Amino acid sequence: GRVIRGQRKGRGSIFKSHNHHRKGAAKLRHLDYCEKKGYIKGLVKDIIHDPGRGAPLAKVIFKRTEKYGKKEELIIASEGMFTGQYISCGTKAPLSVGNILPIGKMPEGTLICNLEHRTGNRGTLVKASGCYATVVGQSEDGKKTKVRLPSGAKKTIDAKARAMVGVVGAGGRIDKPILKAGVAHHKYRVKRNCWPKVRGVAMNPVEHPHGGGNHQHIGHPSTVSRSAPAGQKVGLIAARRTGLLRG
RNA sequence: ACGGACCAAGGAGUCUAGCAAAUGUGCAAGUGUAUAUGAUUCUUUAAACAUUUUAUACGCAUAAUUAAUG
RNA sequence: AUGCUUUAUUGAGUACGAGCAUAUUUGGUAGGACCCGAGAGGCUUUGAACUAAGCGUGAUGAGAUUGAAGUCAGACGAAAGUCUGAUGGAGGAUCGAGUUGAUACUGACGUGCAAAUCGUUCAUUUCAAUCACGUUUAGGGGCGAAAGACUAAUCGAAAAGCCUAUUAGCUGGUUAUUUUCGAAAGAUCUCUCAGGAUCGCUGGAGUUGAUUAAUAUAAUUUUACCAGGUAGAGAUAAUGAU
RNA sequence: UUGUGUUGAAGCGAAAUACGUGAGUUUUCGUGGAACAUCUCCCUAGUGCAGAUCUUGGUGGAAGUAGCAACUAUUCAAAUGAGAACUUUGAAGACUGAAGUGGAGAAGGGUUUCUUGUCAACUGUGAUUGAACAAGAGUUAGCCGCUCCUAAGGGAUAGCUGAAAAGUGUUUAAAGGGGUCCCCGUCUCAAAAGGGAAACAGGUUGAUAUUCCUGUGCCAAUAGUAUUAUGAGUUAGAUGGUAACAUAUAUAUAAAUGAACUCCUUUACAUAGGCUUUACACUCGGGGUGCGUUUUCUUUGCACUUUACCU
RNA sequence: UUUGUUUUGUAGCAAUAGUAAUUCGUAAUUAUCCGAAGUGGUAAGGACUAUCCUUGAAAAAAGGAGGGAACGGCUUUGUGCUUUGCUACUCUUAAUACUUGUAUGAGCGUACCAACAACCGCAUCAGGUCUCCAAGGUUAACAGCCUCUGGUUAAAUAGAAAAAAGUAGGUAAGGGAAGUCGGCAAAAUAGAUCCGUAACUUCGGGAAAAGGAUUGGCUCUGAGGACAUUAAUGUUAACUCAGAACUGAAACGGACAAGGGGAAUCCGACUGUUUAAUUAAAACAUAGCAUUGUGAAAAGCCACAACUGGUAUUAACACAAUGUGAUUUCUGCCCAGUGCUUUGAAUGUCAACUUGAUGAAAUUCAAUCAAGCGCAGGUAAACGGCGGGAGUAACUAUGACUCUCUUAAGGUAGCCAAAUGCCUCGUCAUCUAAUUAGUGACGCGCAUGAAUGGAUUAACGAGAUUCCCACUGUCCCUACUUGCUAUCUAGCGAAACCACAGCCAAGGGAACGGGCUUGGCAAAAUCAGCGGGGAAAGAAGACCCUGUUGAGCUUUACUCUAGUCUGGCUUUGUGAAACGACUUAAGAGGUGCUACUUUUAAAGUUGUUUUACUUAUCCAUUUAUAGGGAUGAAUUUCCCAAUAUGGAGACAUAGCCAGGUGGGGAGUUUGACUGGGGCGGUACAUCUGUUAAAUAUUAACGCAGAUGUCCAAAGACAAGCUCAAAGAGAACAGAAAUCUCUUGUAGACUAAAAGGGGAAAAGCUUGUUUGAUUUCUAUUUUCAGAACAAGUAGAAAACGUGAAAGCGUGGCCUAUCGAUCCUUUAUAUUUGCAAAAUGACGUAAAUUACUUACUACUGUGCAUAUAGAGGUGUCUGAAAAGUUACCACAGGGAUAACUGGCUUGUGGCUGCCAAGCGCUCCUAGCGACGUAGCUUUUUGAUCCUUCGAUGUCGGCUCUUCCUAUCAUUGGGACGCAGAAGUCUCAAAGUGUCGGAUUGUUCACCCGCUAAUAGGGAACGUGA
Ligand SMILES: [Mg+2]
Ligand SMILES: [Mg+2]
Ligand SMILES: [Mg+2]
Ligand SMILES: [Mg+2]
Ligand SMILES: [Mg+2]
Ligand SMILES: [Mg+2]
Ligand SMILES: [Mg+2]
Ligand SMILES: [Mg+2]
Ligand SMILES: [Mg+2]
Ligand SMILES: [Mg+2]
Ligand SMILES: [Mg+2]
Ligand SMILES: [Mg+2]
Ligand SMILES: [Mg+2]
Ligand SMILES: [Mg+2]
Ligand SMILES: [Mg+2]
Ligand SMILES: [Mg+2]
Ligand SMILES: [Mg+2]
Ligand SMILES: [Mg+2]
Ligand SMILES: [Mg+2]
Ligand SMILES: [Mg+2]
Ligand SMILES: [Mg+2]
Ligand SMILES: [Mg+2]
Ligand SMILES: [Mg+2]
Ligand SMILES: [Mg+2]
Ligand SMILES: [Mg+2]
Ligand SMILES: [Mg+2]
Ligand SMILES: [Mg+2]
Ligand SMILES: [Mg+2]
Ligand SMILES: [Mg+2]
Ligand SMILES: [Mg+2]
Ligand SMILES: [Mg+2]
Ligand SMILES: [Mg+2]
Ligand SMILES: [Mg+2]
Ligand SMILES: [Mg+2]
Ligand SMILES: [Mg+2]
Ligand SMILES: [Mg+2]
Ligand SMILES: [Mg+2]
Ligand SMILES: [Mg+2]
Ligand SMILES: [Mg+2]
Ligand SMILES: [Mg+2]
Ligand SMILES: [Mg+2]
Ligand SMILES: [Mg+2]
Ligand SMILES: [Mg+2]
Ligand SMILES: [Mg+2]
Ligand SMILES: [Mg+2]
Ligand SMILES: [Mg+2]
Ligand SMILES: [Mg+2]
Ligand SMILES: [Mg+2]
Ligand SMILES: [Mg+2]
Ligand SMILES: [Mg+2]
Ligand SMILES: [Mg+2]
Ligand SMILES: [Mg+2]
Ligand SMILES: [Mg+2]
Ligand SMILES: [Mg+2]
Ligand SMILES: [Mg+2]
Ligand SMILES: [Mg+2]
Ligand SMILES: [Mg+2]
Ligand SMILES: [Mg+2]
Ligand SMILES: [Mg+2]
Ligand SMILES: [Mg+2]
Ligand SMILES: [Mg+2]
Ligand SMILES: [Mg+2]
Ligand SMILES: [Mg+2]
Ligand SMILES: [Mg+2]
Ligand SMILES: [Mg+2]
Ligand SMILES: [Mg+2]
Ligand SMILES: [Mg+2]
Ligand SMILES: [Mg+2]
Ligand SMILES: [Mg+2]
Ligand SMILES: [Mg+2]
Ligand SMILES: [Mg+2]
Ligand SMILES: [Mg+2]
Ligand SMILES: [Mg+2]
Ligand SMILES: [Mg+2]
Ligand SMILES: [Mg+2]
Ligand SMILES: [Mg+2]
Ligand SMILES: [Mg+2]
Ligand SMILES: [Mg+2]
Ligand SMILES: [Mg+2]
Ligand SMILES: [Mg+2]
Ligand SMILES: [Mg+2]
Ligand SMILES: [Mg+2]
Ligand SMILES: [Mg+2]
Ligand SMILES: [Mg+2]
Ligand SMILES: [Mg+2]
Ligand SMILES: [Mg+2]
Ligand SMILES: [Mg+2]
Ligand SMILES: [Mg+2]
Ligand SMILES: [Mg+2]
Ligand SMILES: [Mg+2]
Ligand SMILES: [Mg+2]
Ligand SMILES: [Mg+2]
Ligand SMILES: [Mg+2]
Ligand SMILES: [Mg+2]
Ligand SMILES: [Mg+2]
Ligand SMILES: [Mg+2]
């Protein structure tokens, strides 16, 4: 009868992100001559907090090379950086925490973050607080590098892509029990409108496949297939397996 | 069992198409002057009057029967 | 082959034509169709001055209670550590007036002051708090701490105008006089059982006949003849009981 | 076809020694004031009402009945007037009790405001009252606001999609600009509580006031040329202090050279808790002035004793 | 740059203004305007501390700095750079004069209300509606009560009287919940100081636990600071706190203000939220726990008609989709069913396209690695599920043990008459006097149980229950009082409703009358109450049934559809390899130049597969900013070679076509009969007998039954023969084996129900057969005298049997079955395919070809006439699943759920007879086996009245009637000594109670009593 809650989220009316006090987008530096041939170095002016995101941001200043002036960058800060530090970005920069290097000049076992899955991309992969990847293989003729991602997947990347040495700061923040409904009210207040959640078994049949009944049950197998239409994919999607995991 | 406090005005088997039966009228193996045209028709007349100077417009009837050549 | 024959069978066929036109009435059909009456379906538009949720900018919560971590001082002890007094001001802490609401009297009123009010009594006040303007989301759609709730006294699908005088085997109504004739509530078929078609029962029109105490005719008798297994009877005649 | 009418038509009220089984027809008197029939035979229709919770309009019994009950409360005397429980004046008794029927604003209303007059209807009892009715009046700004800036957002331009109507909004624009020949970089609307040049006190009208009057101040803008005065610098740019820093007082502290380019600061910011300072408020005692009580008491009870912006 | 003091000034504004006074005149003058402190209400600033998985706008506009471009002036040769002097020149503010378009200050708002009558609510409506200011006393207090400044004394009315009854209040002797479903309502408590506080517990609480004492006024004592002369003297405050004496009708938070407490059970962890106008909860949320998908602009989830978007200013400590619901302790077994998911040319089926074979061609046929299903696995914190019967231990009883059916697995740890147990008011204990209630135990549990979460649980709750203390007008049992109404006056002034109307009893009547019949009776007009009746009013019953009337929701109902997955063709270019296809003479052959299958340097062209390239196409980044190799400030070396960049790349994407999946979505449907409907059944198409009343016809969900088949013989004809059974006889042989005789009217048989028929046959056995065949008519049954269907009597052919007359058109007779449209095979010297031809230039002539005359028989495919067949059992013949406790409409008393009416089976009461009981004795008192009635206080049966409506259980209050008499009054009898009782007569005058449990009517206990009888009045009684 009626359009479901999870279908309405795509209209983007009251489900758009809350971003009034956010500070800007976190990108690497634009790929240019210096990083391809040597390196360039910038100065850390501040570490600041971003309302929606858990990891801190470093505010870093480089010096213009084509012209007289200065320029600004926003970069996810790795654990250990400090105000007044000089970091160096380029193909020949020394290996140290906070420098930005191509992944093909790093030995095996190096912990990295803020990685590009394509060259010149300005960084996409390892970004949430407390996360890192591992260099796990260098190809015989260069041109390819193999890494291990936080979820445990393995990937091969172009060997000229860039990343930061070290781990993302402010890690270990899911070890504190939230303990109050108001704390979770304040958490999602600055993210998006997704809290609280009514469960489908407590609605009427018009609004949900689980709704209705004289006893609050599903009455249906709760694992649905990958091909089901939008108003019907609602329980466990394409589940290979259910129940407690034992290994 | 339902409608009705009282009074006045209004208020409901009609019109058109197509078929049949009954009855009145005209002509009769025929009958009906279609659309038009004509006129010393033109307040009335948007009515009425006329029919192309051994005579093939059309309808119904005058002949039936068969899927059909017939 | 211009097919033939008495045969049988069929036609809304033939055996010296009756039609065409035009008044009116009646019947059945289509149309608004004797008059008034739905619950619905569709097309295009108008509303978030109420209320729901998000967002921007601002404003607001008398008074009192309780007493976490940190700090100072004193006592004990070989160390580790323990005990006593003060200080301090935490917490979706506690009473409570405003504010925001609505538990009970199943009180008053119920032709109200009022299409939700009045009185007393209740719940809530540092937080998931409460208000005001501005702004976003529009109808099979939105919004919902979820009651099928709310979306301008309208929501298990808003409001305005059209398609539209939609359809109804079902309720209600249907307008002057006298005179003459006068019913059925059985039967067959039916997605038929509150309906219909068809036969029966009724009225009107018109011929052919009889008007010759006749013939046709008769919900009646008489004379001649025919068919029957019900009332009674039987159980020793058959069957079955006793 | 052939008739009635100002010497009185239709219609209406009451009737008749009248006719008909009946629907009806005909006639008298009164009112009325202008048209009305045809039955000689035909044509024609939106042609005959007791009902449909029928439509529109008017009117009853109920009935001088139900009722005119929240908000503590009224009394004496006078004026006016045809007429005063509810108009005005004086004297009493009381209420609101600063979280006020006290003052000032927004949304909304639109002349309800003021003076004069004044009662047909309204002001659910009266009414001489009134936000009712009639005639004429009344709203004054460089300093209070809008107007300017940007916000959540709206409308647009290029392009793309669609039969269009419309949807979306740099998704490869030779755009928009500003700086004097260069660089930067879409347009526009959206806050009378956010941001933001600048004003105070006294007086004044029937009705306006940080707007009018008086006096004293502030802010912003003010072409070119020439003269005259105010100060400063050089015989292409001043000094003091160890330092933190300081210095132009002319009517008026106005002048301490500085291009392209570049970097910062103000505007500019949450909540809770106690400590502290200063203004406004409140109160106690002296002095002056006026008033009140006074059979008894009382060096006594109350009022006033003020000071803005700007330098 | 020095001293007390030169002395002035509210520092200027400034007294010239404001306020309070005293003056003199019909605008006039004077005097004051100045000395020291306290309290802490309101606002703002300052320096600080702490909190956040929460870190709390921007722009117009203004300012500061770095750096060092340019530059002493007036005329002085020339072509902006070349020549001579003075060492006034450069800024800055103000005023003036002239040239200049006319060289200060735009435009719009401004009255009044802001609710008390100016706004919205139909109004001059007790409602709603945003912001700022805020005095004195009491006090913790901006609370409550009283007051000053300012405001008012007004409300759609007044006067009198004062009874019932109402509404808002106040008291009550003795008892203290006995009232009631229920302590509903009301009382009792309460401020502050000092003492004292349990179980349990997540150690934080519970907690104001529970409890005890004090409190006025007056007169005193003690404690707590600051400052200046020097330990000593002197001045000087604010408010609290602790003690003592005295005093009063023993009173003192004196008015106001202000918790009732305790022992346990159930649910939910907690603060929070919800159905605006009948539900505030145990419902929703929540922290915590667990499961699932996804490494990216070719990804997960979602929006759009397309083009494009949301999450995303994102990146696994993330985003998205679900369950359960704090802590503690736990979370058992099942993958057979249904879902979801993994592998693939070994593998079955499953499209378009393509490729071959054949043919004149249209067609026809065959082959080929798509996805999906099938085949083989995983998964229960996916949907869900988790057994019976017997025997057995030295008194009984029980069953550790055993046997046997049996499942995918057989309910584990726990828990229980639980918000879950029918029987049920379960058994035992406890609580009371008395317990359908409460608590603790028991467990073969109709039908308990593990994130559908199981068992607990401190704290918390306007949540659901039981008991105790305090308290009381809830009650015994009511009385007295105040305001405001009602009442009577002057003024003003409606509405609902209304066929006509309004006294009764019985009768009949649509079975409950105001009106009708027969009786009782019946005398103006008027005031205040009241709730028996007018089956009173409101309003086309919402319950129930009907309608070929709807709508919301569900699904493995009937048809479809968005989206997803999969294959083909086009977009679409340049090369190169490797294997497949259709051809060479070979290969063994089997066959009568020849016919078919078979190992290899191909006759030459086409196909899936792999790889390479860049310009089509797609993506990303930037201001399209250097061609490859070796926490100051920065602006005016060498080697390698002459499409912005990078990544993919003819693959994605996109357009047309094809297949799978698809309640996410759309449209629709979901028979009838029926002692209401539903369930059951078929009485829905047929047949035998009976009801059926001696022609024929005739109903019910009447009675006893049968049909949807069967048979090359069980059909046709002819001949011969005679059956069931019984008796007596015959080696094994008997009750039953084979054989002979005698009797035998059918007692046998004849496919199947039942009825009728049948003896040289209709039965049995033999012989020959296919009339169970082709065509047509007159007609009978049901009936409209319509179709099918099943029969009867015949005619035109060709046959069978029999010697012959004859008989045969299925079964000895009565049942055994099917339209239009469509399809399919048969028949024909019958026809068509819209200008014509197709056997065939066949036969005979003729020539110099457009020659002539003759002929039953003429391409593929399709159509058409006539005859059978494929089926409609709802059988005169639609392609069709559920639910509504969210509901809508048109109707029905044609039809259910009350009262009333007829009946009285069942329920209740009363009779008659005498077997027997009563030691003995039929009848004191009873009464078996039988049998006659009465009543309408039970429950049925029926469907008469009411569906545009007669309020549906019980209790409380109040009146009246009946007798089928419990007590009280007079009597009779006994199995009657007295006492106490039992049976019975006249008799309705007077009575027929207080309580515990339950919503109860009904029950069952504790009591008293004289007795604690039974009933009716629309199941008496809801304006
Ligand atoms: Mg629900
Ligand atoms: Mg659904
Ligand atoms: Mg549940
Ligand atoms: Mg189930
Ligand atoms: Mg009716
Ligand atoms: Mg009526
Ligand atoms: Mg005629
Ligand atoms: Mg014709
Ligand atoms: Mg009509
Ligand atoms: Mg429809
Ligand atoms: Mg609004
Ligand atoms: Mg809002
Ligand atoms: Mg709290
Ligand atoms: Mg009430
Ligand atoms: Mg209330
Ligand atoms: Mg519901
Ligand atoms: Mg209609
Ligand atoms: Mg008659
Ligand atoms: Mg006339
Ligand atoms: Mg009419
Ligand atoms: Mg009329
Ligand atoms: Mg009338
Ligand atoms: Mg009336
Ligand atoms: Mg009255
Ligand atoms: Mg008045
Ligand atoms: Mg007062
Ligand atoms: Mg008061
Ligand atoms: Mg107050
Ligand atoms: Mg006025
Ligand atoms: Mg006036
Ligand atoms: Mg009046
Ligand atoms: Mg006026
Ligand atoms: Mg102005
Ligand atoms: Mg201003
Ligand atoms: Mg914006
Ligand atoms: Mg603007
Ligand atoms: Mg402002
Ligand atoms: Mg004024
Ligand atoms: Mg003013
Ligand atoms: Mg001063
Ligand atoms: Mg004003
Ligand atoms: Mg209005
Ligand atoms: Mg009113
Ligand atoms: Mg009002
Ligand atoms: Mg009273
Ligand atoms: Mg007293
Ligand atoms: Mg008492
Ligand atoms: Mg009791
Ligand atoms: Mg009782
Ligand atoms: Mg109860
Ligand atoms: Mg109470
Ligand atoms: Mg306790
Ligand atoms: Mg709760
Ligand atoms: Mg729990
Ligand atoms: Mg709560
Ligand atoms: Mg409600
Ligand atoms: Mg409520
Ligand atoms: Mg819950
Ligand atoms: Mg959760
Ligand atoms: Mg399985
Ligand atoms: Mg396959
Ligand atoms: Mg067990
Ligand atoms: Mg149990
Ligand atoms: Mg129990
Ligand atoms: Mg489990
Ligand atoms: Mg269960
Ligand atoms: Mg009165
Ligand atoms: Mg009577
Ligand atoms: Mg009556
Ligand atoms: Mg009478
Ligand atoms: Mg009554
Ligand atoms: Mg009805
Ligand atoms: Mg109904
Ligand atoms: Mg429907
Ligand atoms: Mg559906
Ligand atoms: Mg039926
Ligand atoms: Mg008979
Ligand atoms: Mg016989
Ligand atoms: Mg024979
Ligand atoms: Mg036979
Ligand atoms: Mg049928
Ligand atoms: Mg039939
Ligand atoms: Mg349905
Ligand atoms: Mg009836
Ligand atoms: Mg009986
Ligand atoms: Mg009625
Ligand atoms: Mg009644
Ligand atoms: Mg009624
Ligand atoms: Mg008796
Ligand atoms: Mg006696
Ligand atoms: Mg006696
Ligand atoms: Mg009753
Ligand atoms: Mg009775
Ligand atoms: Mg009632
Ligand atoms: Mg009752
Ligand atoms: Mg009553």
Reading the block at residue A48, the tokens are: 């600041």
- The full DSSP string for A144-200 is EEEEE-TTS-EEEEETT-EEEES-BSS--TTSS----HHHHHHHHTTT-S--S---G
Nucleotide D174 C1' to residue A81 CA (A): 47
> Rounded CA gap, A39 and A162, in Å?
13
Q: How far is the CA of A199 from the centre of ligand 54 (A)?
A: 19
Half-sphere exposure of A187 (CA within 13 A, CB side): 13
Asked if A49 CB < 7 A from strand C, the reply is: no
What are the beta bridge partners of residue A70?
Answer: A63
Structure-determination technique: cryo-EM
Asked if A49 CB < 7 A from strand D, the reply is: no
> Rounded CA gap, A233 and A213, in Å?
20
Protein-covered nucleotides of chain C (CB closer than 7 Å) are: 53-57, 92, 127-129, 136-137, 140-148, 156-157
Q: How far is the CA of A211 from the centre of ligand 16 (A)?
A: 11
Q: How far is the CA of A174 from the centre of ligand 95 (A)?
A: 66
Reading the block at residue A130, the tokens are: 């407390």
Using left for φ > 0, alpha for ψ between -120 and 50, and beta otherwise, residue A114 falls in left
What are the beta bridge partners of residue A43?
Answer: A61, A86
A160 is in an annotated binding site: no
A209: enclosing H helix or E strand: none
Reading the block at residue A206, the tokens are: 């018009």
Strands A223-224 and A162-165: unpaired
Best CA proximity match to A161, nearest among A184, A179, A180, A135: A135
> Rounded CA gap, A25 and A16, in Å?
17
Nucleotide E383 C1' to residue A192 CA (A): 34
What are the beta bridge partners of residue A134?
Answer: A111, A148
> Rounded CA gap, A79 and A65, in Å?
29
Resolution of the structure, angstroms: 2.5
